[PDB]
Design a protein around this ligand. Structure first.
Ligand SMILES: C[C@H](CCC(=O)NCCC[N+](C)(C)C[C@H](O)CS(=O)(=O)O)[C@H]1CC[C@H]2[C@@H]3[C@H](O)C[C@@H]4C[C@H](O)CC[C@]4(C)[C@H]3C[C@H](O)[C@]12C
Ligand SMILES: Nc1ncnc2c1ncn2[C@@H]1O[C@H](COP(=O)(O)OP(=O)(O)O)[C@@H](O)[C@H]1O
Ligand SMILES: [Mg+2]
Ligand SMILES: [Zn+2]
Ligand SMILES: [Zn+2]
Ligand SMILES: [Zn+2]
Ligand SMILES: [Zn+2]
Ligand SMILES: [Zn+2]
Lengths: 142, 662, 75, 590, 142
């Protein structure tokens, strides 16, 4: 009975050993992953929402059409977003209108990397390589 | 006004003799000459108005260039209170040779060193007085958002939770703040106005409050009897630069601790208190701040007050329910001690808007004096006055640190000192008694049906405005009347009252409007009815006490009251943890076990998805244990021989929590 | 469950922004925390959603702190 | 602490003990490593030594686990089980384990001593993770062996916060690194055993050093500290990013009518454009260092970080960008060491600009849009892993020629290395060929380039120049005094002494020699600007005095002769001793 | 058996006293360190003091006691104004010199909430939204 009971003590002392062991290891296991891992959590859980505005916006971000500032929410406020391709301009800008974040915007700037004031008509099929890509748009919300 | 002028005794006397000339009681501009604790309140009441005509730069500590070891210090050898007048230290050592640890502690705690060394500050963000800024750039502190526990939320939404048409959705979140949080929350001290309380009535509400605080015993204790709950807590400024409080409780022996405590009984130590932004879950977006009092004030205040503070927290069935658990049928016992001889019971509970920032300095001084009425044997009179001065210099109105900058606290309690729940309970009992007195006096008198209570009102008026000494017989009679018709239950700002309905309808005990008027003219805040409830049915208990709704359930053969929390709060605590190691879940089963303990009474609620929270937490603990065992089976080859967790996912462990046997 | 679903996404997005040290720019952190606290206190699906769009645009403008392309093919 | 296995990437916690780098190792993988090699120590979260009061049995196949400790055969408990059983070593994650056959190369990688020339071959054909491990343990073994240590002893113990130090005069001293270690060497009679693992950071006052130790034993009077073993950073990024082929231009924005000089390479800028990483190979003096600026002026809106292993190449790139790129925002990064002079004409240390100039060991952890790695001939796998881990860009550009000199590799003293085994990029450009090419000499005259167009290249390189006929070939003894273990040749600098008075057009000449000692002493003798073969790679030199000193396998290689002779843009004088190398050159015979 | 059972608790109490004495020694060594830190802090703040004006205002006093709130008001050589918006900037420290506490201060530096330098021409009515308020101007006594 004696060495059976002190054997109890051996396995429970090992319970300290194992429980401390697991807790400390998983502690900075949870620290090391989390930043990039919780970015992945943010994107998985963002994608779970399935809102066409967020979908439109981050599929435009994938192609390089990222905004240069925060998107304003009040009517008639300034947004500036860079256009990286003629196809991206063709999909979103029709006429003087600019659809983005499932919203309607009208154009104040088209402007290129040369910071040269540029006007709206020459962006076309055969004149697109002539442009200094990428272009920066300034828009207001309608 | 002259800048260097700090002694306005002649001006105070001239104002008193010009305005209150025929007020025949003696008035001491400096409260150090007062007769007793009923003369300190009176002269302080006169001073709190007489100090509103003097420049605000003439208050604060009184520094004096002393020389140590041939090198010139500049230290605070006194204080010029707005209420207690000018107080001078009895022990100043102009030519010191060796500085012991007590002397280093005192000369590092006081703001004279830092304010003298620091650069001049002009802060336009707040209307409060700004003294100095130590570092060369103002520090802006923000609050991070909470950390999402996606596993728990996914388990919840897989169990039919968080829909539209749900009575239970997330309402307690971890709100974040910008860099202007601490400075815009310290600005709420602008609501604290210099309030002159009615003195012929406060000097009787003091007697009633002391009768409420008559069962307990207290006094001074030695340094080897003071017990601290946690030693790893902070030690304020500037002591947080070198370590926690444990360093200062271990470096200082009992001898030089008692030496410091006895030094504070005949000296004033001004003290810097930090403002720390809280990282906690809440239902509204405003930043909450707590005041971090340093260790030099805290140790002496513990040695002064801990006997009474732990005597209050060890008595059951009294008015101040501190130290009484809500488990093991403690809630039921408190709630049946409330219902002790009330004629036609009705339940009432009020709310103080900006309770800790709008309190007048007079009520805090009163609370400190009522808590210091147990030192009639251990302490002398000058020792008690200097302890009150130290409390006012370390708690009430002293320099406040808000992001590397020293400001001036206009008044009100700092909510992080040694006596905050108890002093706040004294303040709440004062407001209740003042409301009762105002309701009783404001009644007509000819409409009074009971002929005794008309005589009681007559005697109340003659003991208020026609007597200068205590009438202990009438104080006992009025206290018995209050305990008979206005039974109370206080934890520091939450009161549940079982007042007489008939007397209140006639107007002979305090009602909601009486408390509103009292808070208007003695607290400089407005009490709207929108957050103060009245319960007309005694079988459902108070609407809300300590953020716990209560209800009547059946246990065994009889009926008991069980406090159930807001399920939104519990779900928010589960979903939004404040750390990354609390997100994984398998590391922390105690978190969810404690949450299930706290939210067990929801099962007995009539609404079903209120009750579903307990089963959600229980199944979550089950799944958490299952996957923890799976992980520890994968990361080893041996499965735990005594896995003792089997009782955490069946309701006996939580049902036994609210049974009065233990 | 569409409503209690955005209110957590704001929390995780603000945590990611704090991870990428938007906190060091007081001006940007201003409307970052502004939109976060306003989305937490929201009643309709709409203003929650384009405030979500505005808050995510902060992470959108960031060229090198994020790399947008990895965090969205395998998911 | 836990980790990942090397050759199977499974979760594990068994470090090997006798491996040079102390890596993480699996269960079955560790069983196979310690059952076939001489490595017997294994570090779990606790060491696998016997737990008797006095016993030293560190082999893992040899002990037994009873209770919670490790015991030997003599001190075994009645109830226990051996660690190495069923083909595995006892450790965490026992049955979540998978093995491989990569141990056949792993054993040879961890067993060799890296002085042979076949292990270097093995370290470049196996899988990626074993490549990274081999490079890491190469760097570790180099730091152990070369420039090893000087003996140090502690005179007295002042305190446990600050220590006393006494270097032995006669040997140098390595400085502070937490990566460096000084193993305790109380070696007297009397426990010649590791008493701990230490590093030393010095104080600003008196004779004191504030150490950092990993043991709880006080110092003896005879305890010593000699630096054995070193820990280099465990990089994770592969040597080469996996290739992905594009169809149209991505992430880059081309220009129309870019310039006149770069018009021949526009198709080249596309093929750089629609590939993930592209490689350029070309004989020296053909415009490899010019193609980077061509890329810059073809892709103007994109940031490009320009980086090379040395400072001379990045400085020549600085010069070419200084003449072609806009001066206003261009950058240059110097390390915190600031040991040597750099190109301080742009913004020094501005990481947020469009054209960043840096050296591989001092890059910041930032992004880019095109990265152009210059002169991979100076690049090992370690430098490639560094630039892959630190720089994170859409396009990679690898420009260089394996025919120029490889890395020093001071351990390599036996055998010969082929150009395709210098690193992974060389293995790419020599096996499957470079993507794109130029060969045409505009630097050295037709004579000397016709000489070198038979030694290293067999007649694939012509020139557009004249045979200016001042490539003087001289053959003399040049008596060699072997002073500093680096060759000094006083009579060679003497024949050069007195063959400079006869030539008035050679007073601007530059002295080149494959031995640094004679190289340095040539400064006061004759006063010309003075450079070695290794550090003169990249810059163009009008007149060159090359001086081959000895007969050996060190200075008689055709590669270093190639780079030393091809830097003379108009004329060169070469001093010599050899006869196979003199038989094939076409110089004026004297 | 009785004697050995007696000696076991003896070893227990010996270890307990050993641990208490070891902890007390470490407490003493921490006390010395915190004492040294406090002494150094106090003496450095003494070295920071402006002794001439302080001596002047103390000698002007009757008892030698002055309020603490006027020590920086009359002896501090450097002043910092924290300014929440533009109107308060125009009202308290417009220009390069301003008057507070009956003295004349010259603005040596202006920094925003992000500790970035802001030139004094940058603070305009129209250019206020582009500044990271609050502004911390730093001035010296003249
Ligand atoms: C005796 C026990 C199992 C007995 C058994 O069941 N034998 C028979 C074979 C079992 N099967 C399934 C292989 C067949 C073995 C198996 C796993 C061992 C632990 C961990 O690894 C390491 C851990 C960290 C440090 O090192 C300190 C000791 C620790 C606590 C170890 C204690 C103990 O030593 C354990 C429980
Ligand atoms: N197309 C060209 N037209 C005129 N000169 C050129 C042309 N290409 C290169 N050069 C000249 O040749 C030199 C080549 O230098 P460098 O780029 O160092 O060669 P490599 O990198 O091939 O050793 C440059 O200094 C440049 O002036
Ligand atoms: Mg070149
Ligand atoms: Zn008095
Ligand atoms: Zn007392
Ligand atoms: Zn090994
Ligand atoms: Zn393995
Ligand atoms: Zn043994």
């Amino acid at each position: 009975d004696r060495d059976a009971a002190m054997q109890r003590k051996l396995e429970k002392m090992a319970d300290q050993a194992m429980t401390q062991m697991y807790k400390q290891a998983r502690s900075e296991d949870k620290r090391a992953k989390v930043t990039s891992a919780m970015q992945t959590m943010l994107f998985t859980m963002l994608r779970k929402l399935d809102n066409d505005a967020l979908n439109n916006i981050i599929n435009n971000a994938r192609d390089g059409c990222v905004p240069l500032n925060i998107i304003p929410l009040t009517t008639a406020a300034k947004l500036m977003v860079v256009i990286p391709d003629y196809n991206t301009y063709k999909n979103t800008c029709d006429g003087t209108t600019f659809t983005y974040a499932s919203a309607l915007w009208e154009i104040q700037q088209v402007v290129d990397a040369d910071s040269k004031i540029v006007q709206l008509s020459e962006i076309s099929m055969d004149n697109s390589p002539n442009l200094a890509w990428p272009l920066i748009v300034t828009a207001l919300r309608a | 006004w002259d800048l260097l002028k700090y002694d306005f005794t002649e001006e105070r006397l001239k104002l008193f003799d010009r305005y209150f000339k025929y007020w025949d009681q003696t008035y001491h501009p400096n409260c150090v000459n007062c007769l007793d604790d009923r003369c300190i309140l009176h002269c302080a009441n006169f001073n709190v108005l007489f100090s509103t005509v003097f420049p605000p730069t003439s208050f604060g500590p009184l520094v004096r260039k002393i020389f140590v070891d041939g090198v010139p210090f500049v230290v605070s050898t006194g204080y010029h209170f707005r209420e207690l007048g000018v107080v001078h230290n009895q022990d100043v050592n102009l030519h010191s040779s060796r500085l012991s640890f007590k002397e280093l502690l005192v000369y590092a705690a006081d703001p004279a060193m830092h304010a003298a060394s620091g650069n001049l500050l002009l802060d336009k963000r707040t209307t409060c007085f700004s003294v100095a800024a130590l570092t060369n750039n103002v520090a802006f502190q923000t609050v991070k958002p909470g950390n999402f526990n996606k596993d728990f939320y996914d388990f919840a939404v897989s169990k039919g939770f968080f829909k539209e048409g749900s009575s239970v959705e997330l309402k307690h979140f971890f709100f974040a703040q910008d860099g202007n949080a601490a400075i815009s929350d310290y600005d709420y001290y602008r609501y604290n106005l210099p309030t002159m309380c009615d003195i012929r009535q406060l000097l009787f509400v003091v007697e009633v409050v002391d009768k409420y605080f008559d069962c307990y015993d207290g006094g001074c204790i030695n340094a080897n009897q003071v017990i601290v709950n946690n030693l790893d807590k902070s030690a304020g400024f500037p002591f947080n630069k070198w370590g926690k409080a444990r360093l200062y409780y271990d470096s200082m022996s009992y001898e030089d601790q008692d030496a410091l405590f006895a030094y504070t009984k005949r000296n004033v130590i001004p003290t810097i208190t930090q403002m720390n932004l809280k990282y906690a879950i809440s239902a509204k977006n405003r930043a909450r701040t707590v005041a971090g009092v340093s260790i030099c004030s805290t140790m002496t205040n513990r040695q002064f007050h801990q006997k009474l503070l732990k005597s209050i927290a060890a008595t059951r069935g009294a008015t101040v329910v501190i130290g009484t658990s809500k488990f093991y049928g403690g809630w039921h016992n408190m709630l049946k001690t409330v219902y002790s001889d009330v004629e036609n019971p009705h339940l009432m509970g009020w709310d103080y808007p900006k309770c800790d920032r709008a309190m007048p300095n007079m009520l805090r001084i009163m609370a400190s004096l009522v808590l210091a009425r147990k030192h009639t044997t251990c302490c002398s009179l000058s020792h008690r006055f200097y302890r009150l001065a130290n409390e006012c210099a370390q708690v009430l109105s002293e320099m406040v640190m808000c992001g590397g900058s020293l400001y001036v606290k206009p008044g009100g309690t700092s909510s992080g000192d040694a006596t905050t729940a108890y002093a706040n309970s004294v303040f709440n009992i004062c407001q209740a008694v003042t409301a009762n007195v105002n309701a009783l006096l404001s009644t007509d008198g000819n409409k009074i049906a009971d002929k005794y209570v008309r005589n009681l009102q007559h005697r109340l008026y003659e003991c208020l405005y026609r007597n200068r000494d205590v009438d202990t017989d009438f104080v006992n009679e009025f206290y018995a009347y209050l305990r008979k018709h206005f039974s109370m239950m206080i934890l520091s700002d939450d009161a549940v009252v079982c007042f007489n309905s008939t007397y209140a309808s006639q107007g002979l005990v305090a009602s909601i409007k009486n408390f509103k008027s009292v808070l208007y003219y003695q607290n400089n805040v407005f009490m709207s009815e929108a957050k103060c409830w009245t319960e007309t049915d005694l079988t459902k208990g108070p609407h809300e006490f300590c953020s716990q709704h209560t209800m009547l359930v059946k246990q065994g053969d009889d009926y008991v009251y069980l406090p159930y929390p807001d399920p939104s709060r519990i779900l928010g605590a589960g979903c939004f943890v404040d750390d990354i190691v609390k997100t994984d879940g398998t590391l922390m089963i105690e978190r969810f076990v404690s949450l299930a303990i706290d939210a067990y009474p929801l099962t007995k609620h009539p609404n079903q998805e209120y009750a579903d929270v307990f089963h959600l937490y229980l199944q979550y603990i089950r799944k958490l244990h299952d996957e923890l065992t799976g992980h520890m089976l994968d990361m080893y080859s041996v499965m735990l021989t005594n896995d003792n967790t089997s009782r955490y996912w069946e309701p006996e462990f939580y049902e036994a929590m609210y049974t009065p046997h233990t | 469950s569409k409503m209690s679903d955005v209110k957590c996404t704001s929390v995780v997005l603000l945590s990611v922004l704090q991870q990428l040290r938007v906190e060091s720019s007081s001006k940007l952190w201003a409307q970052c925390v502004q939109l976060h606290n306003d989305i937490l206190l929201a009643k309709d699906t709409t203003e929650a959603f384009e405030k979500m769009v505005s808050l995510l645009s902060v992470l959108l403008s960031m060229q090198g702190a994020v790399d947008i392309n990895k965090l969205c093919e395998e998911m | 602490a836990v980790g990942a296995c090397v050759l199977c990437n499974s979760q594990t916690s068994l470090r090997c003990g006798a491996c040079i780098r102390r890596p993480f190792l699996c269960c079955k993988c560790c069983y196979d490593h310690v059952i076939s090699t001489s490595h017997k120590l294994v570090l779990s979260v606790n060491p696998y030594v016997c737990n008797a009061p006095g016993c030293d049995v560190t082999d893992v196949t040899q002990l037994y686990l009873g209770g919670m400790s490790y015991y030997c055969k003599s001190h075994k408990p009645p109830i226990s089980f051996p660690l190495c059983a069923n083909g595995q070593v006892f450790g965490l994650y026992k049955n979540t384990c998978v093995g491989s056959d990569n141990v056949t190369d792993f054993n040879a990688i961890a067993t060799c001593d890296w002085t042979n020339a076949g292990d270097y071959i093995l370290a470049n054909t196996c899988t990626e993770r074993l490549k990274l491990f081999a490079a890491e343990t190469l760097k570790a073994t180099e730091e152990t062996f070369k420039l090893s240590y000087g003996i140090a002893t502690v005179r007295e113990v002042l305190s446990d916060r600050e220590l006393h130090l006494s270097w032995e005069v006669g040997k140098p001293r390595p400085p502070l690194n937490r990566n460096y270690v000084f193993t305790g060497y109380r070696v007297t009679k009397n426990s010649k055993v590791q008493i701990g693992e230490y590093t030393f950071e010095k104080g600003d006052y008196g004779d004191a050093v504030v150490y950092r130790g990993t043991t709880t034993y006080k110092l003896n009077v005879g305890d010593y500290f000699v630096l054995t073993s070193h820990t280099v950073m465990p990089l994770s990024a592969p040597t080469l990013v996996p290739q992905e082929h594009y169809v149209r231009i991505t992430g880059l924005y081309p220009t129309l009518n870019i310039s006149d000089e770069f018009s021949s390479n526009v198709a080249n800028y596309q093929k750089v454009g629609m590939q993930k990483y592209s490689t350029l190979q070309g004989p020296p003096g053909t415009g490899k260092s010019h193609f980077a600026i061509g890329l810059a002026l073809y892709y103007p809106s994109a940031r490009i970080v320009y980086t090379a292993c040395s400072h001379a190449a990045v400085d020549a790139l600085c010069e070419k960008a200084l003449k072609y790129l806009p001066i206003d925002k261009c950058s240059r990064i110097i390390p915190a060491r600031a040991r040597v002079e750099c190109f301080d004409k742009f913004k020094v240390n501005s990481t947020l600009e469009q054209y960043v100039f840096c050296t591989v060991n001092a890059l910041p952890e930032t992004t880019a849009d095109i990265v152009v790695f210059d002169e991979i001939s100076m690049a090992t796998n370690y430098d490639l892993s560094v630039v892959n881990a630190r720089l994170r860009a859409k396009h990679y550009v690898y420009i260089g020629d394996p025919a120029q000199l490889p890395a020093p590799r001071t351990l390599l003293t036996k055998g010969t290395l082929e150009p395709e085994y210098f690193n992974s990029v060389c293995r790419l450009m020599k096996t499957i060929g470079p993507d794109m090419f130029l060969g045409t000499c505009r630097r050295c005259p037709a004579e000397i380039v016709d000489t070198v167009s038979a030694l290293v290249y067999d007649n694939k390189l012509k020139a557009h120049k004249d045979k200016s006929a001042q490539c003087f070939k001289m053959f003399y003894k040049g008596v060699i005094t072997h002073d500093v273990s680096s060759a000094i040749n006083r009579p060679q600098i003497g024949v050069v002494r007195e063959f400079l008075t006869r030539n008035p057009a050679w007073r601007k000449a530059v002295f080149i020699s494959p031995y640094n000692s004679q190289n340095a002493v040539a400064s006061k003798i004759l006063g010309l600007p003075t450079q070695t073969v290794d550090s003169s790679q990249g810059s163009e030199y009008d007149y060159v005095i090359f001086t081959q000193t000895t007969e050996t396998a060190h200075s008689c290689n055709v590669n270093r002769f190639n780079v030393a002779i091809t830097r003379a843009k108009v004329g060169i004088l070469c001093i010599m001793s050899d006869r196979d190398l003199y038989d094939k050159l076409q110089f004026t015979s004297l």
